[PDB]
Structure formats: C-alpha cells, structure tokens
C-alpha cells in the first residue's frame, strides 16, 4: 500500500537519467542538417535519430544494473530497442492538437508528410501516429513514462541477448515498481498497467515495420550515404 | 605552334566537366551541418568535404578515358587523389586578400583557425595555405586549372592501381595538351608548366600530412562518428 525505499530510489534514478538526456529546449536541433520540405527530409531526420540514439545510450547507462551487463548484452539491448525508445521518448514532443511532433520552432515541427520525405510509408507512419495519440491519452506521469522506457530497454526477449536471467530479473524489478507506483500514486489507474504493457507490444510491431523499411533505405547507397555512422551501426545487422 | 583539334576537344570536355561540378553560387552549402566557431567545425567541414568528394567523382567521370578504366582502378585513383583534387579545386574560392576560402557569405568563409577546430594542425595548414597562395599567384587560365586537376587524378603512381600503362598514357596525353596550351595561349608562360608540375609534387606532401592527421580523427570514435559515410569510405584504408 506504499512504495518501498528501494523502489523510490529506482524511480529517482530513472527520472534524473531522463532529465539529463532529454533537453526540452531542443536548442541542439539547429546543429542538424536543416530540414527540407526526393528524400528531402532524410538528412535532417537522420541527424535527429542519430542525436536521439546518443541520448538513449546515455539514458540506458543510468538505468540501475544496465552498466553491469556485458558489453555485448548492452549492445544487443540497444540495437533491438533503440528505435522503440525513440518512439516512446518522442511522445514528449507529440501534440494531439497538431497530430505532429513539435520541437520548439516551426522548422522543427514534424508531420507525417515530413517523414514520408525521409523514405518511410504510411504502413509505418499510420500505426506510429495512432500509437502516439493512444500513448498521449494515457496521460502518464513522468515517473511512469521513464519506467516504461527502462522496461522496454531491459527486455530479455531480444535477438542476441546472452544473460537472459539477469536482464529479466532487472526488468521484473522495474515492472514491480511501475505496478506499485500506479496503484499507490496514480488515481484511477486500475487499468493503466495493462494498457502500458500493450504499448510495449505495439512497439514490437512498429519496430518490425521500421526495420523492414530501413532495410530499403540502407540497401540503396544514394540514401544510406545520407545516414550517420551511428545510425548505420545501431540500425545495422552486424552481430557481436 | 597551334593546338590540334583533338587537343581542344579534351580541353572543351574538361572545362564543361568542371563547370557542371563546381557551383560558383555555393548555395548548396546551407544544406551542411552549420559551422560552429572541442572540434566545433568538424561537422560542417566533414559535410563540405563529403559534398566535394561527390563533385570530384562527377568530374572524374567526365575525364576522357576515366570511365573506360576498371572499377577498381577508378576507385584506386579516387581514393588516393580525392584530397589533392579538393585542395586544387578549392583554390577557386581562396582569396589572397583574406588568406581564406570565401564561399559566398561570411558563414562560409574558412580561416586556418576554422580548420584547426576540425582536428587539423599547423603542420598541415601552414603548407596548405602557402600552397594556395602560390597556386593563386600562378593566375591559371580555367583551361589550365582543369587540366591540372585531370592530370592529378590520372596519376599512375598511386597505391593500388593495376592498369599502369593505360593510365600513364591518358595522363601523358593530358600533359601534352597542357604544355601545348601554355606555349600557344598563355603569354609569358615559359616557366609555367614546370611550376604546375611542382604543385603536383607539393600536393603529394600535403596528401601525406593530411592522411596522417586523418588517421588520428578516424581512430577516435567520438570524432569519426561526426564524419559522413562517403568520407569514411574514400579516406579509409579498405582495399579493392
């Protein structure tokens, strides 16, 4: 009926980790190749994604226990989950009014139409936007949002993970925290935990569709040359 | 005492090739990651170099005979010579008044100090700037400038070339053209051909120093991640 002290330490650590790696001013965005509105938005969006991967790495490194995993497992988790975390963390900039991600100025407002000009199709972008509004409607506390990113990251059912038992134990601890937080601190959240778990299922489907469409980009050198080295590494298919 | 018809065809082809691949308006530069003045200029200069490599490829493809070389030889010539051609072609933006490369607006004016903020040292930048002023003082006709870029590109003494005899024959033809052009069309150019050949020697030394310093960048992943895929490919050490 009350959160334990070690549970709230986990929440505090995760909130601080997200605050250190998510800059609400979006002032770094001016450093990206500018947006252009065939794949006119691919340079800007490639830089946005590459920048966001670095932030997700920085967040991962501050999840309790992640840094104690083997380097291979840390990479395996990041390679399969980075795109899902980007999709989850982007909900903070998503607007129900505009049906778009608004990152400060109008140059950094991203429509569905912008993302099609980076090589993606409605097969991905329709479920992605439905995901964003459903997630936005959940009205998650910051505590819950960061717990869900951490649970997503620490999923043991990813290709290439070795220490399955250690990662599942870590994820189990985080799920316990989130269930207890919702029950005690979220008024009217009786169905919230189940909804959040469903969103993790949705992200798997979005992950699959994104990887399919990314393979088309990466197989065409005039497009893949527009990506960044970090995007090529993380979204690529090399195995450790 | 007069240029032959096949010699002036070569000149015409090369001039047209340079005009198609060198845009004097510099309007594409706004598409690069913006300049920032530790290696604050590395993103902008990486994009400038990557863009310039694409132009040098496009110029190479229009040199008579280059496209008839094997793909491996085309790559070998481009990998060893791209940095020299960039240094040669950049003389068009170099200003004796400012001791700098001025590409339209003041955001795209590059000092020696700008290039140090991309990871290079005076060991490279001092000889590079002395090279630019000496080359600028030669006051080359456009015909001569483009011939020298083509002769530079078509050098058979590069690591990894296979069809040495074919490439040297091509370069010999271009040298004959340039010697004849200077003699007939360049008043007071008795010593010009020798000076231009010396500049090719200077570029070898600049190439060596650049490759040495590039190896330092490329061995540090926080810097190499700022490069482009094309720069990593062309300036890298992989062999076909």
């Amino acid at each position: 009926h009350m959160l334990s002290d070690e549970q709230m330490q986990i929440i505090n650590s995760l909130v601080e980790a997200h605050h250190k790696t998510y800059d609400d001013s979006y002032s770094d965005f001016v450093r990206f190749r500018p947006p252009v509105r065939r794949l006119s938005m691919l340079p800007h969006l490639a830089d946005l994604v590459s920048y966001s991967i670095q932030k997700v790495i920085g967040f991962a490194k501050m999840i309790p226990g992640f840094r104690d995993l083997t380097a291979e497992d840390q990479i395996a988790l990041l390679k399969s989950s980075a795109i899902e975390i980007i999709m989850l963390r982007s909900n903070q900039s998503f607007s129900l009014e505009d049906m778009s991600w608004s990152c400060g100025g109008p140059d950094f407002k991203y429509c569905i139409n912008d993302v099609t000009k980076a090589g993606h199709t409605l097969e991905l972008l329709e479920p992605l936007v439905k995901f964003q509004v459903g997630l936005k409607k959940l009205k998650l506390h910051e505590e819950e949002h960061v717990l869900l990113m951490a649970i997503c990251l620490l999923s043991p059912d990813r290709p290439g993970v070795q220490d399955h038992v250690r990662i599942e134990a870590l994820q189990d601890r985080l799920c316990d925290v989130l269930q207890a937080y919702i029950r005690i601190q979220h008024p009217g959240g009786r169905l919230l935990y189940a909804k959040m778990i469903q969103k993790l299922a949705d992200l798997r489907s979005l992950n699959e569709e994104h990887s399919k469409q990314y393979r088309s980009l990466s197989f065409q050198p005039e497009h893949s040359m527009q990506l960044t080295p970090l995007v090529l590494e993380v979204f690529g298919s090399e195995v450790s | 005492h007069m240029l032959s018809d096949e010699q002036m065809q070569i000149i015409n082809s090369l001039v047209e090739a340079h005009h198609k691949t060198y845009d004097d308006s510099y309007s594409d530069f706004v598409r690069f990651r913006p300049p920032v003045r530790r290696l604050s200029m590395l993103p902008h200069l990486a994009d400038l170099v990557s863009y310039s490599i694409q132009k040098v490829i496009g110029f190479a493809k229009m040199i008579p005979g280059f496209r008839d070389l094997t793909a491996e030889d085309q790559i070998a010539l481009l990998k060893s010579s791209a940095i020299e051609i960039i240094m040669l072609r950049s003389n068009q933006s170099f200003s004796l008044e400012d001791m700098s490369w001025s590409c339209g607006g003041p955001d795209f004016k590059y000092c020696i100090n700008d290039v140090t903020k991309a990871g290079h040292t005076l060991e490279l930048l001092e000889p590079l700037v002395k090279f630019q002023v000496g080359l600028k003082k030669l006051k080359l006709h456009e015909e001569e400038h483009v011939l020298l870029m083509a002769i530079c590109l078509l050098s058979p003494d590069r690591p990894g070339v296979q069809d040495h005899v074919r490439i040297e024959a091509l370069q010999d033809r271009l040298c004959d053209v340039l010697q004849a052009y200077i003699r007939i069309q360049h008043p007071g150019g008795r010593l010009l051909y020798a000076k231009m050949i010396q500049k090719l020697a200077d570029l070898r030394s600049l190439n060596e120093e650049h490759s040495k310093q590039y190896r330092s960048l490329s061995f540090q992943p926080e810097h190499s991640m700022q490069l482009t895929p094309l720069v990593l490919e062309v300036f890298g050490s992989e062999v076909s």
Binding site: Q54, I57, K61, I75, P229, S240 | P221, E222, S224, M225
Partner: peptide
Amino acid sequence: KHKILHRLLQ
C-alpha cells in the same frame, strides 16, 4: 565492430 557503440558505452 560496433566501434562507436563501445566508445559511447564508455
């Protein structure tokens, strides 16, 4: 392999 990832993971 995964040169940048290793570096970013410290």
